[PDB]
Design a protein around this ligand. Structure first.
Ligand SMILES: C[C@H]1O[C@H](O[C@H]2[C@H](O)[C@@H](O)[C@@H](O[C@H]3[C@H](O)[C@@H](O)[C@@H](O)O[C@@H]3CO)O[C@@H]2CO)[C@H](O)[C@@H](O)[C@@H]1N[C@H]1C=C(CO)[C@@H](O)[C@H](O)[C@H]1O
Ligand SMILES: C[C@H]1O[C@H](O[C@H]2[C@H](O)[C@@H](O)[C@@H](O[C@H]3[C@H](O)[C@@H](O)[C@@H](O)O[C@@H]3CO)O[C@@H]2CO)[C@H](O)[C@@H](O)[C@@H]1N[C@H]1C=C(CO)[C@@H](O)[C@H](O)[C@H]1O
Lengths: 517, 522
């Protein structure tokens, strides 16, 4: 019996999952072809990255129409077949809600640009006069998350430069004014539209966004990484009224809809407010995702996640915004794989839910050596090449050792929207499926054993002392040990007699073992 | 008795005709279910687009094995039953010969890739070292017909980028070296294999292909559509020795086998050499197909076709590579339908044979609005999304008004528009004024009154937008213009047989009328 509390969710980055028509862009027809593989892995749900009409300047997170599928991804009819088939395989379906900003191509923003200062069209966004004698300075000192000014100046009807608009991310992603009532009205309709098609819930992009301080005050810390968190730009009290309204909307359905927030705030007190019983069901536990390979750092991040997350956090070790775990833990392919295997086996034993990013079950490394001309992330161009960006974790997946695109399609290599390295076939899904010791087989074994032997009602009971290189805990009749160090480890007899259930490779170095007690 | 001279051939694009097993792909069981309808319409033969084993990167024209049926379409024994049933209905069967190139999945090409430079395996294809200091430039400046370079570089077994191979069409369609003796031997066997199963003849794909100039010279005209005809890439003298060989094989059967070439050459004089008595029986009269709706242009194309075809050319107004007639002539449904009805009625009165592309008898338009994710034609990707391609004339046919796929199945490999149900065959069959009923009436009347060898006799001039001729006692007038046309008394008293529009002597605008002389009236 399905429970969001314990769900294992497969994150589908549709552009790079599977390409059914051979134009190099992953699509809904390709996801249909691969749903069997996701269900056979043992997942409970899928989360689709944004597949709405988008000019792709931020690869789907710049949305030009929230009620339509992008034609490069398919049709509404193909979408409905994805949902029907996913449901038939026992999978729930989460879509991505991107309501902090839209594409500059969106009809509302085209209207704002064509209207005059102070118009209702501009009042749905954040337009301000510039500073300086000719308005040539930005209205405040905020940085775009992607680098540069968070403001872009527009041209007015008489052809002169005029007001600026705010964009927390790319220049082509203007931020909504969430104090304008039409904004909330539009997005309640977006929720109801997709829920009517059987979508089971939403992952909320930039859940710490939407509302800014009404004064848009300068960040007193300056610009750049050492300025610290910009308290006026994020995480405002009004956002909890928003999430109370969305939760009430989703709770009208049977079963109730599900919301998981993408929240990046420094304070655990601020994070916990998003998780009150009448707001969001969960939020990603990012503390663990950002830790290096270190027993003390892992345990502290786990303790932090359990204490705010009311006992059942949404764990994740990778997503479409960060380097793949094999690369993060390699500091070396052999070392990164061993640690990624142990980390996957540890996180899938934690109480709560787990989000698996496509390709992590294959142990793919990050592709850091892309040619300059191949990169497409706005971070790459906005930083003048000083920040690589995220393309290395978005490479089209290998499905078979054979084929010019390794089974991502039947097409030529030059079609794929990002290039696959010639060695990607070494990580092919079909190869790993035939190998019981593969990363794919480890994930299959983990999900089967987790379902058989663990219950979400069993909390962690720590067995190891704080500070040790060996992390150990009990849940119910299962004992989990992760040896982060270089020395083998014999569990002490006081923990009880142990019978092994699985292992990511005595507890050998850099290995996770599940045992029955 | 049947004659190839005036056969009406139904072109079956199998993937989009009818789906009998519910996977969204047309198949042989679906064709079997529709043979009765083709014969009832009034056709004398079918031509099947390629249905051999193929990965479908060019939807059957990239063949992986020439002695097979693709498993998605059925088995060899199901094909045999289709041929028997077609023959039992009086239909002859043409298959598609695709001998300029094969799929890169073909065993010979897999063997070529696995072998070394200079091997016999590569000698059956056209592998060359690249130009430039590191071989990074293609061996010459030729274009693929679908867009981009006509060459693809391979990786050699030591991992270095190495030789390039030539492909006139997609990268996955390597061209044979027709100077290698094993190629001719292979295709003589292909002919005998299918002829032994009762196939009556072949439509020859890229009949201006096969042989290239042996030096593979750069095209001095450059690249792209303004470069002009690439004389070194096509239409070489050795291709006529090839067709003399195939015709000599076909002439030993009783009745002799039939060859119709798909020939695209810049000059109609160049077409004639392919039609000499020891070569191909016919070639599509593409000059008429490319003309806009205009009386002068149509007449000149018909005169040219009759001359090249020795009086009995193979007419066609559409196929699986061009926009459907309703769209070409409308380019606007009502005007396109009116003109397509008038054009079908004119073309079916010309001396010779006629090829009807499936769906043109329903008056289907081109489906130009497909989403990017639905496009499958290699032209789409190879043009970087700048050329639409051919998928819009390959949409699965509507059979019934009802049903999620309009009776094509019971998702389709290409999506049908919501409005396709308006064109359903069963709806048109019950409507005497439908495009389908017009084709049925045209074919019945053609068989009764245009069954002889009477040539065209052009009638006297009467204005710029009128085309008119007589064959024996049958008079045909097509009014291309916007005004009604009253024929002159000098042509004689005319009794109407049929018209492309539903009681006067005047020919209404954009209409073709067939009439008879000497009926004792007025
Ligand atoms: C794209 C993303 O930007 C913001 O989030 C954070 C970045 O994802 C991280 O790079 C973060 O840095 C931490 C590292 O991840 C971690 O490994 C460690 O080194 O600590 C770092 C601390 O500097 O920095 C950003 C904030 O701290 C933003 O909050 C988040 O919402 C964004 N993700 C979504 C937003 C957009 C715009 O629609 C999309 O482009 C993304 O794909 C979404 O997933
Ligand atoms: C697919 C087809 O390509 C070749 O023929 C095409 C010409 O190369 C094009 O230029 C175009 O001709 C047009 C003229 O440019 C224009 O001035 C006007 O006269 O209209 C013409 C027709 O629209 O279109 C031609 C037809 O598409 C090639 O010569 C021909 O053999 C090709 N057809 C077969 C070949 C293959 C490859 O095996 C298949 O993909 C096709 O389905 C076959 O039918």
């Amino acid at each position: 019996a399905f429970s969001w509390r314990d769900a294992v969710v497969y994150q589908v980055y549709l552009r790079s999952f599977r390409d059914a028509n051979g134009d190099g862009i992953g699509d809904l027809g390709g996801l249909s072809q691969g749903l069997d593989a996701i269900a056979a892995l043992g997942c409970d749900a899928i989360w689709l990255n944004p597949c709405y009409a988008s000019p792709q300047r931020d690869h789907g997170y710049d949305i030009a129409d929230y009620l339509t599928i992008d034609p490069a991804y398919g049709t509404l009819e193909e979408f409905d077949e994805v949902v029907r088939r996913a449901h038939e395989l026992g999978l729930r379906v989460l879509m991505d809600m991107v309501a902090n900003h839209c594409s500059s191509d969106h009809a509302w923003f085209q209207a704002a640009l064509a209207a005059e200062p102070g118009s209702d069209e501009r009042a749905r966004f954040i337009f301000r006069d510039g500073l300086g004698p000719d308005g040539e300075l930005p209205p405040n000192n905020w940085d775009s998350v992607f680098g540069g000014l968070a403001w872009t100046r527009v041209t007015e009807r008489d052809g002169r430069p005029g007001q600026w608009y705010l964009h927390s991310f790319d220049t082509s992603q203007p931020d909504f004014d969430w104090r304008h009532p039409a904004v909330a009205e539009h997005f309640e309709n977006v929720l109801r539209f997709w829920f009517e098609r059987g979508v089971d819930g939403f992952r909320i992009d930039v859940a710490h966004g939407h509302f800014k301080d009404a004064a848009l005050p300068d960040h007193p810390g300056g610009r750049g990484p050492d300025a610290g968190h910009n308290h006026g730009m994020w995480d405002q009290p009004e956002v909890h009224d928003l999430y109370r309204s969305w939760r009430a909307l989703g709770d009208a359905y049977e079963p109730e809809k599900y919301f998981v927030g993408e929240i990046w705030v420094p304070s655990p007190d601020r994070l916990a407010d998003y998780l009150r019983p009448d707001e969001l069901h969960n939020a990603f536990s990012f503390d663990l995702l950002v830790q290096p390979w270190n027993a003390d750092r892992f345990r502290k991040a786990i303790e932090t996640g359990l204490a705010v997350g009311r006992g059942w956090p949404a764990w994740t070790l990778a997503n479409h915004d960060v380097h793949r775990a094999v690369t993060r833990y390699g500091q070396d392919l052999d070392r990164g794989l061993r640690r990624a295997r142990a980390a996957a086996a540890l996180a899938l034993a934690l109480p709560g839910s787990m989000y698996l990013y496509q390709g992590e079950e294959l142990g793919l490394p990050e592709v850091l050596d892309l040619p300059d001309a191949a990169r497409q992330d706005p971070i790459w161009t906005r930083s003048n090449g000083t920040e690589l960006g995220r393309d290395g974790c978005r490479i089209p997946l290998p499905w078979t050792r054979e084929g010019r695109t390794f089974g991502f399609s039947d097409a030529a290599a030059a079609t794929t929207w990002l290039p696959q390295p010639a060695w990607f076939g070494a990580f092919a899904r079909a190869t790993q499926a035939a190998d019981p010791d593969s990363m794919l087989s480890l994930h299959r074994d983990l999900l089967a054993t987790r379902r058989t032997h663990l219950r979400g009602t069993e909390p962690i009971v720590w067995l190891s002392p704080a500070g040790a290189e060996v992390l150990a805990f009990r849940r119910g009749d299962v004992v989990v040990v992760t040896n982060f160090g270089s020395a083998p480890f014999t569990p002490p007899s006081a923990w009880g007699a142990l019978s092994p259930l699985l292992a990511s490779q005595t507890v050998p170095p850099e290995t996770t073992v599940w045992s029955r007690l």
